[PDB]
Structure formats: structure tokens, C-alpha cells
């Protein structure tokens, strides 16, 4: 009928007859949201906000794997800093010229072949190894698991509630003593010792 | 709800939490709000109910009044196991019961949970204030020896 | 959640508002004409003639219907859809930044031409800058007005049936899921696997499938083959649509697609077309004849214009 097409022209159809079903929280529940996950199936083209936790976990993995080869790289620069002292020591110059100071020329031929081959070889294998671990863990970050044939994606939200003591109570002791709070008693009317400390 | 003892509430009465009282007497709230002259429609009266104005509790005070309520445990081992009492609004999440009877209910307070039934009708009020209210029966039907002995 | 809906809840709301006699009778005569949309009271003359005279004029039933329109889900029944909008605007706020007036100008008349675009009408209402755009935002924020019932908590999942997997550049059936029962399921998982082997979804639509071929393969009866696939739905990695890949034709041509790609690709060719409003069925039939589908242009125009297609009314 035409009036349905008119209604579709007004609001842009506003999804029209497509239903309202939602996750809305039942009553008796309050508090904030701890975390949101939203796992997705492979090939869903999710976009939305689900890439933010992907980038966050990627930053966590990068920050976790960086310090190891920063310390080990500091050890490489420590052994290079140790071998460059044996000859041709420019002191602050070599201190103001980082990145191996372009190998510091050739120095002696033995230090040329041994020091240059060891520094470039070990350094290249450490860089390529870190890139390999980072790409493998990168394959681990973005992926999907097994799921039911009739499910597309699943959203997960966590909640938290602060609950404070009230006359309901039911605290227990270690000797087997039960009990409940009869009333909430103000401070000023309770008994106190000779020093004035209330019970 | 859970029962808590207190040194008041003469033998016919019980402490009724205000959060529990508002929902049980809700239809009487609708009736007296439509009656006393502040109202428009029943749905707007509801709107006033969940908006909880300070006048609504002033209504409820006159709602409860002389119209007592029934108490029930899960077990009933005799006739007196259930009794009626006059509600009195008390702040808390727990119900307050009169101390003098630990016997007819047979249960001390470990935090046991208790049931509260509200009859309405009309003559159910008199039926509640005649053959049920605790001040009417001071004796046990199987003996004749006085119950509710202090301890 | 096993709850009462529609004229049960609406009539239960009618019983609350006190109606001595006539207001209750004509009220119950109004509440039965409510539909899923809720704003359709159909013909008022039918409600007047259904009373069978004996007074109860139209002026008396007009206020009763107006009282029906004031119920909980804002606008209810009334007529023309231009009424319930006025009630939506009256009980909304009553204090607004000049939204009430302009709301009565837009809702009153001229709203028919203002829904597609404003243009010259922007000079008719005298509004300018962000007042008109914010008013249109309010109109977009209003509302179908009812449809608050339903309460459809559950969806009735397809739960699949039988399944398939693509290997080395080839798709084969597996019938994965979950002695006479094992073999009974092995027959369907067998003929279904060979049917998935002969038919590949492949790329773009699906290969035409004829029940005579699947019936000739295993020498099974085509009635039993297509009878099971009609009720049950085979769930593959994409889609839902099991009987659609069973029923087809011979296309009546040597150079060819079946009705699946005929109507499917027909609506796809009609999807991108008509730079303004060509609405030409003969041109689409010529485009179908250019591909060698042997279209008589009688079946392409009638069959292509069906199934939600705007044709031929798009002209």
C-alpha cells in the first residue's frame, strides 16, 4: 500500500517491521559495567568498537615483548661498547654517535670480520626473531574459535555491585555462633569504658 | 523476609518494612489517590507511585491503619502456627516480630525466612480480628495451659 | 512470556475507565477494529451502521473514539494517521522551544510534500537556519505509533539440518550434526553429499539443479528427495533455502541459469538501471535476450516485476 511507502520515506523506513528484541537488564540489578568483550565469528566484518580491544591487546603484547630485547639489545650494545674500547676509542664521540657509529669503520681486520659479522649477524637474527614472534602473536590476537551453526556473534558485558551491611546481616563466628543485626545502633548512646572508647 | 527482634510492638503488631508495604497495598494506594482528589488517570497515579512523592507515604499511613496482615511459616504444626498482626512501618530490609512468642512458631532467629499473606475481601478483616489475632488466644488448643510464657 | 495482548489488554484498559452503558457498548465496538499497527479504525460508517440506529449519533461516538485514542500507547486508532500524530504532539511535553506551533503547521497539512524534501516549502513555513532542521528532527523523533505489544522474547532458530565442507578447490557434503537410524541418516547424508557435489554454490548464484538429475543419480524417487528438503532446511556455511536449490526448470533454451538466476539476476540487473526513471520492461527483456537466455519478454516483465520489485509501478 502507498502509505507504507510514505512512512518509509518519512523516517528512512526506520528499520520498519524489524523487531525490537534487546538485552535490556532485568530489575533488581544496578551498578556499572566492568568490561565488554563481543567475540565475533571469522568473516563477519565486525568493525564497530571490537577493534579497540584488539589494538589494546596488541599494545599489551608489544609492550610485554619489547623489554626483553631492549635488555638483550642493551647487552649487545654493552659487548660492542666493550670491544670498541680495545682500540680506536673516541670516547664521547662514540657516545654521541649511536647505532654502532656505522660499525666504527673496520678497526682491525680481526675486529672487522669478527666484530662486524657477529654484531650484524646477531642483531639481524634478533630483529627478525622479534618480528617473527610479533607476527605469530599477531595471528593469535585476531582470529576466531568454534561456535554453533546458528550463532553469528556474541556480546558479553560484566557488572559489579557494592553491597553494604544492613539489619539483614547473618554474620557468623569461628565457634559456631550465628546471629543477625537487631538494629543499627548510633555511637553516642552505646556503653563506653573509663577512657571513653565505645564498643 | 528475615525476622528481627525488638523491644516494642505490643502483642498485636509487627514491624513491616516500608519497601514491602508499598507494593502490597498498591491497589489501595490507587484507590485512595483517585479518591482524596489528587489524580488524573490510573496510569498517572502509577507514575506518582514510582515517583514516590512524600505525600504517597502519608496516604499509606492512612491505608494500613486498622487493617492487619497474616503471617505464615513454611511448616504449620498446629492452629496457632499462623497469626495476624497490625503492621507498623519500620526502616529496614527485615520484618520485626513480637518477642513474647518463640513457642507457637517454634523457631528462634538464625535468619529464617517468613511469609506474609494479605487477605482483603471485606469480612476477611473481621475474620482476621476475631478468630486469628494473637491477643484473642492466650491458650493452646491441645492443653489449656497458658502459652506465651516469658523467658 | 505467556501474557495477554491486543484487545485483551486494551479492553482491560477500557474496563478501568468507568463506562455506564453506551460508552461501554460503543467502546467494545471500537476496540475490535484495532489492528497490529493500531491506528486503523477503517470505516466509521461501518461502526455507526453496526449499532443498528436507535439514536447513538455520530457526535456521541466521536468523543468515545477520541477517548479510545487517549489510551496508554499514545496515539490509538483514529484515522488517516494525521490524527494520532496530533495526540502524540499534545501529550508529549506541552512546554517546547516553539515546537508545538510548527508541529501543528507541519502535522496539520502540507506534510505530504515535506516528507520527501523541503525545498520551496522551507519558504512556506517561514522557518530558517536550524529551527526548521531541528523541527524536522523532532518529526523524525516521534514514531507506526503503537506496536508496543508483541513482547517477542524468543526467535525459533533454524538449528540447521545437514552440513558441508570445501576441500582442495572442491565442496563435498559431510552431514555433520548432533543401525537402522545410522543407515537411515547415512542415506540422506549420502544423496545430500552427492547433491552438494553436483551443485556448487560456487561463484555467483548457484548452478541450475533439476530434480530429475538428483533422482537419476541414486535412482531415488524425486518425490521423496524433494519432499524431505521442503520441510527441512540444509544449513551450509553461508545462507539458510534448501528447496530453492532443488526446484527449477530447463530454461527452455540450449544456451543456458534456471528461474533462480533468472529472477535473481533479473532483479540484480534491474537493481542498477533507470538513470532517472526509465521503468522499461522491454529494455530489461532486451538485456536478458542479449545474454542468450531466450526471453519472450512476456515472462521476464511479469516475473521480474514481482517479489518486492518496484516495477512496473516505478514509472
UniProtKB/Swiss-Prot annotation, chain A:
The modification N6-acetyllysine is found at residue 127. Co-administration of salinamide and rifampicin or salinamide and myxopyronin suppresses the emergence of resistance to both antibiotics. Transmembrane segments: none annotated. Acetylated on several lysine residues in the presence of glucose. DNA-dependent RNA polymerase (RNAP) catalyzes the transcription of DNA into RNA using the four ribonucleoside triphosphates as substrates. Resistance to the antibiotics salinamide A, salinamide B, rifampicin, streptolydigin, CBR703, myxopyronin, and lipiarmycin can result from mutations in this protein. The RNAP catalytic core consists of 2 alpha, 1 beta, 1 beta' and 1 omega subunit. When a sigma factor is associated with the core the holoenzyme is formed, which can initiate transcription. The rRNA transcription and antitermination complex (rrnTAC) consists of RNAP, NusA, NusB, NusE (rpsJ), NusG, SubB, ribosomal protein S4, DNA and precursor rRNA; S4 is more flexible than other subunits. In pull-down experiments interacts with CedA. (Microbial infection) Interacts (via flap domain) with Escherichia phage lambda antitermination protein Q; this interaction renders bacterial RNAP resistant to transcription pausing and allows it to read through termination signals. Belongs to the RNA polymerase beta chain family. This is DNA-directed RNA polymerase subunit beta. It comes from Escherichia coli (strain K12). The lineage of its organism: Bacteria, Pseudomonadati, Pseudomonadota, Gammaproteobacteria, Enterobacterales. The chain holds residues 896 to 1094 of 1342 of the full protein.
UniProtKB/Swiss-Prot annotation, chain B:
Acetylated on several lysine residues in the presence of glucose. Co-administration of salinamide and rifampicin or salinamide and myxopyronin suppresses the emergence of resistance to both antibiotics. Mg(2+) binds at residues 108, 110, 112. It comes from the Bacteria. The RNAP catalytic core consists of 2 alpha, 1 beta, 1 beta' and 1 omega subunit. When a sigma factor is associated with the core the holoenzyme is formed, which can initiate transcription. The rRNA transcription and antitermination complex (rrnTAC) consists of RNAP, NusA, NusB, NusE (rpsJ), NusG, SubB, ribosomal protein S4, DNA and precursor rRNA; S4 is more flexible than other subunits. DNA-dependent RNA polymerase (RNAP) catalyzes the transcription of DNA into RNA using the four ribonucleoside triphosphates as substrates. Resistance to the antibiotics salinamide A, salinamide B, rifampicin, streptolydigin, CBR703, myxopyronin, and lipiarmycin can result from mutations in this protein. Belongs to the RNA polymerase beta' chain family. This is DNA-directed RNA polymerase subunit beta'. It comes from Escherichia coli (strain K12). The gene is rpoC. The chain holds residues 353 to 503 of 1407 of the full protein.
Amino acid at each position: 500500500t502507498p502509505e507504507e511507502k510514505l512512512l518509509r520515506a518519512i523516517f528512512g523506513e526506520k528499520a520498519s517491521d524489524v523487531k525490537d528484541s534487546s538485552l535490556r537488564v532485568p530489575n533488581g540489578v544496578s551498578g556499572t559495567v566492568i568490561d565488554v568483550q563481543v567475540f565475533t565469528r571469522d568473516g563477519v566484518e565486525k568493525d564497530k568498537r571490537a577493534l579497540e580491544i584488539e589494538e589494546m591487546q596488541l599494545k599489551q603484547a608489544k609492550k610485554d615483548l619489547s623489554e626483553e630485547l631492549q635488555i638483550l639489545e642493551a647487552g649487545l650494545f654493552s659487548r660492542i661498547r666493550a670491544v670498541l674500547v680495545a682500540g680506536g676509542v673516541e670516547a664521547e664521540k662514540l657516545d654521541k654517535l649511536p647505532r654502532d657509529r656505522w660499525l666504527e669503520l673496520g678497526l682491525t681486520d680481526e675486529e672487522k670480520q669478527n666484530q662486524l659479522e657477529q654484531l650484524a649477524e646477531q642483531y639481524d637474527e634478533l630483529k627478525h626473531e622479534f618480528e617473527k614472534k610479533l607476527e605469530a602473536k599477531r595471528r593469535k590476537i585476531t582470529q576466531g574459535d568454534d561456535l554453533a551453526p546458528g550463532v553469528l556473534k556474541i556480546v558479553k558485558v560484566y557488572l559489579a555491585v557494592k553491597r553494604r551491611i544492613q539489619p539483614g546481616d547473618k554474620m557468623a563466628g569461628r565457634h559456631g555462633n550465628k546471629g543477625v543485626i537487631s538494629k543499627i545502633n548510633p555511637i553516642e548512646d552505646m556503653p563506653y569504658d573509663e577512657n571513653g572508647t565505645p564498643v | 523476609s528475615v525476622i528481627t527482634v525488638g523491644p516494642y510492638l505490643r502483642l498485636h503488631q509487627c514491624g513491616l518494612p516500608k519497601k514491602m508495604a508499598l507494593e502490597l497495598f498498591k491497589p489501595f494506594i490507587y484507590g485512595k489517590l483517585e479518591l482524596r482528589g489528587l489524580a488524573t488517570t490510573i496510569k498517572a497515579a502509577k507514575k506518582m507511585v514510582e515517583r514516590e512523592e512524600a505525600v504517597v507515604w502519608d496516604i499509606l499511613d492512612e491505608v494500613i491503619r486498622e487493617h492487619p496482615v497474616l503471617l505464615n511459616r513454611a511448616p504449620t504444626l498446629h492452629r496457632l502456627g499462623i497469626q495476624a498482626f497490625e503492621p507498623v512501618l519500620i526502616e529496614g530490609k527485615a520484618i520485626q516480630l513480637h518477642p513474647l512468642v518463640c513457642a507457637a512458631y517454634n523457631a528462634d532467629f538464625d535468619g529464617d525466612q517468613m511469609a506474609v499473606h494479605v487477605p482483603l475481601t471485606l469480612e476477611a478483616q473481621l475474620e482476621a480480628r476475631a478468630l486469628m489475632m494473637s491477643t484473642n488466644n492466650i491458650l493452646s488448643p491441645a492443653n489449656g495451659e497458658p502459652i506465651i510464657v516469658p523467658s | 512470556e505467556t501474557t495477554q495482548t491486543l484487545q485483551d489488554y486494551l479492553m482491560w484498559q477500557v474496563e478501568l475507565t468507568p463506562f455506564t452503558d453506551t460508552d461501554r457498548a460503543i467502546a467494545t465496538s471500537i476496540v475490535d477494529a484495532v489492528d497490529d499497527t493500531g491506528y486503523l479504525t477503517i470505516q466509521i460508517e461501518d461502526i455507526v451502521d453496526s449499532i443498528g440506529d436507535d439514536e447513538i449519533g455520530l457526535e456521541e461516538v466521536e468523543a468515545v473514539l477520541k477517548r479510545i485514542q487517549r489510551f496508554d500507547p499514545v496515539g490509538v486508532a483514529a484515522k488517516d494517521l494525521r490524527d494520532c500524530l496530533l495526540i502524540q504532539l499534545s501529550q508529549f511535553a506541552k512546554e517546547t522551544p516553539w515546537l508545538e506551533e510548527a508541529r501543528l503547521i507541519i502535522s496539520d497539512h502540507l506534510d505530504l510534500l515535506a516528507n520527501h524534501d523541503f525545498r520551496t516549502l522551507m519558504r512556506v513555513t517561514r522557518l530558517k537556519e536550524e529551527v526548521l532542521k531541528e523541527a524536522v528532527n523532532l518529526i523524525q523523533s516521534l514514531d507506526x505509533x503503537x506496536x508496543x505489544x508483541x513482547x517477542x522474547x524468543x526467535x525459533x532458530x533454524x538449528x540447521x539440518x545437514x552440513x558441508x565442507x570445501x576441500x582442495x578447490x572442491x565442496x563435498x557434503x559431510x552431514x555433520x550434526x548432533x543401525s537402522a537410524n545410522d543407515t537411515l541418516l547415512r542415506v540422506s547424508r549420502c544423496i545430500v553429499e552427492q547433491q552438494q557435489a553436483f551443485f556448487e554454490q560456487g561463484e555467483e548464484y548457484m548452478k541450475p539443479m533439476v530434480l530429475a538429475d538428483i533422482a537419476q543419480a541414486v535412482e531415488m524417487h524425486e518425490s521423496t528427495i524433494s519432499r524431505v528438503t521442503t520441510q527441512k532446511y540444509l544449513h551450509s556455511p553461508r545462507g539458510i533455502x534448501x528447496x530453492x536449490x532443488x526446484x527449477x526448470x530447463x530454461x527452455x533454451x540450449x544456451x543456458x541459469a534456471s528461474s533462480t538466476a533468472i529472477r535473481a539476476l533479473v532483479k540484480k540487473l534491474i537493481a542498477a538501471e533507470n538513470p532517472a526513471k526509465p521503468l522499461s520492461d522491454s529494455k530489461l527483456t532486451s538485456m536478458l535476450s542479449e545474454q542468450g537466455i531466450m526471453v519472450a519478454r512476456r515472462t521476464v516483465a511479469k516475473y521480474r516485476e514481482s517479489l518486492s520489485i518496484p516495477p512496473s509501478n516505478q514509472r
